[PDB]
Motif scaffolding. Structure first.
Motif, PDB file in Angstrom:
ATOM      1  N   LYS B  42       0.536  -1.374   0.468  1.00  0.00           N
ATOM      2  CA  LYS B  42       0.119   0.090  -0.434  1.00  0.00           C
ATOM      3  C   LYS B  42       0.934   1.318   0.048  1.00  0.00           C
ATOM      4  O   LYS B  42       0.483   2.788  -0.315  1.00  0.00           O
ATOM      5  CB  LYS B  42      -1.002  -0.170   1.387  1.00  0.00           C
ATOM      6  N   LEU B  43       2.198   1.667  -0.182  1.00  0.00           N
ATOM      7  CA  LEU B  43       3.219   1.897   0.213  1.00  0.00           C
ATOM      8  C   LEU B  43       4.154   2.183  -0.834  1.00  0.00           C
ATOM      9  O   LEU B  43       5.710   2.641  -0.670  1.00  0.00           O
ATOM     10  CB  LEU B  43       3.753   2.250   1.551  1.00  0.00           C
ATOM     11  N   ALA B  44       4.056   0.801  -1.891  1.00  0.00           N
ATOM     12  CA  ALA B  44       4.897   0.605  -2.985  1.00  0.00           C
ATOM     13  C   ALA B  44       5.010   2.349  -3.962  1.00  0.00           C
ATOM     14  O   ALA B  44       6.120   1.921  -4.038  1.00  0.00           O
ATOM     15  CB  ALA B  44       4.257  -0.235  -3.909  1.00  0.00           C
ATOM     16  N   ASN B  45       3.553   2.735  -3.373  1.00  0.00           N
ATOM     17  CA  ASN B  45       4.103   3.686  -4.873  1.00  0.00           C
ATOM     18  C   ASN B  45       5.064   4.848  -3.999  1.00  0.00           C
ATOM     19  O   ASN B  45       5.680   5.803  -5.028  1.00  0.00           O
ATOM     20  CB  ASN B  45       2.724   5.041  -4.495  1.00  0.00           C
ATOM     21  N   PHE B  46       5.863   4.940  -3.141  1.00  0.00           N
ATOM     22  CA  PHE B  46       7.275   5.508  -2.849  1.00  0.00           C
ATOM     23  C   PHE B  46       7.724   4.964  -2.616  1.00  0.00           C
ATOM     24  O   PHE B  46       7.620   4.224  -1.463  1.00  0.00           O
ATOM     25  CB  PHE B  46       6.723   6.188  -2.292  1.00  0.00           C
ATOM     26  N   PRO B  47       9.006   4.506  -3.212  1.00  0.00           N
ATOM     27  CA  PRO B  47      10.399   3.487  -3.558  1.00  0.00           C
ATOM     28  C   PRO B  47      10.451   3.389  -2.211  1.00  0.00           C
ATOM     29  O   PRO B  47      11.397   2.577  -2.241  1.00  0.00           O
ATOM     30  CB  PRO B  47      10.617   3.256  -4.393  1.00  0.00           C
ATOM     31  N   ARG B  48      11.900   4.953  -2.435  1.00  0.00           N
ATOM     32  CA  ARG B  48      12.788   5.135  -1.310  1.00  0.00           C
ATOM     33  C   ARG B  48      11.714   5.185   0.920  1.00  0.00           C
ATOM     34  O   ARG B  48      12.516   4.031   1.153  1.00  0.00           O
ATOM     35  CB  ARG B  48      13.509   6.442  -1.216  1.00  0.00           C
ATOM     36  N   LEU B  49      10.218   5.418   0.456  1.00  0.00           N
ATOM     37  CA  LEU B  49      10.484   4.650   1.783  1.00  0.00           C
ATOM     38  C   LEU B  49       9.407   3.798   2.195  1.00  0.00           C
ATOM     39  O   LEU B  49      10.035   3.364   3.201  1.00  0.00           O
ATOM     40  CB  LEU B  49       8.340   6.084   1.606  1.00  0.00           C
ATOM     41  N   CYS B  50       8.983   2.585   1.263  1.00  0.00           N
ATOM     42  CA  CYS B  50       8.067   1.578   1.362  1.00  0.00           C
ATOM     43  C   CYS B  50      10.244   0.601   1.750  1.00  0.00           C
ATOM     44  O   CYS B  50       9.728  -0.329   2.711  1.00  0.00           O
ATOM     45  CB  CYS B  50       7.798   0.451   0.315  1.00  0.00           C
TER      46      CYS B  50
END
Lengths: 50, 50
Positions: B42-50
């Motif tokens: 669900k947080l894959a949209n932000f690569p560096r965060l996930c």
């Protein structure tokens, strides 16, 4: 039940036979020394020998 | 009968529970690491965060 507790108590009792046993040896020594002194009255005529 | 023989055998058996018990912790670690990876889709949209 403790196998060693049995042994512990017995070893106490066996040790108590030293008294009457040593006493016995003395009672024998007494009769023995009395007897050599009894026999040597037949040799009393010779003071230095007896 | 040897009180200590009983204890001897049991201690062997208890020691044998370390294997299946540690394995269990890993099986939990597996499902736990699986779950954080499920959630983070669900947080894959932000690569560096996930």
């Amino acid at each position: 039940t403790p196998d060693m507790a049995f042994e512990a108590i017995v070893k106490k009792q066996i040790v108590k036979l030293k008294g009457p046993s040593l006493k016995s040896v003395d009672l024998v020594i007494q009769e023995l020394i009395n007897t050599v002194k009894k026999c040597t009255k037949k040799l009393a005529n010779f003071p230095r020998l007896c």
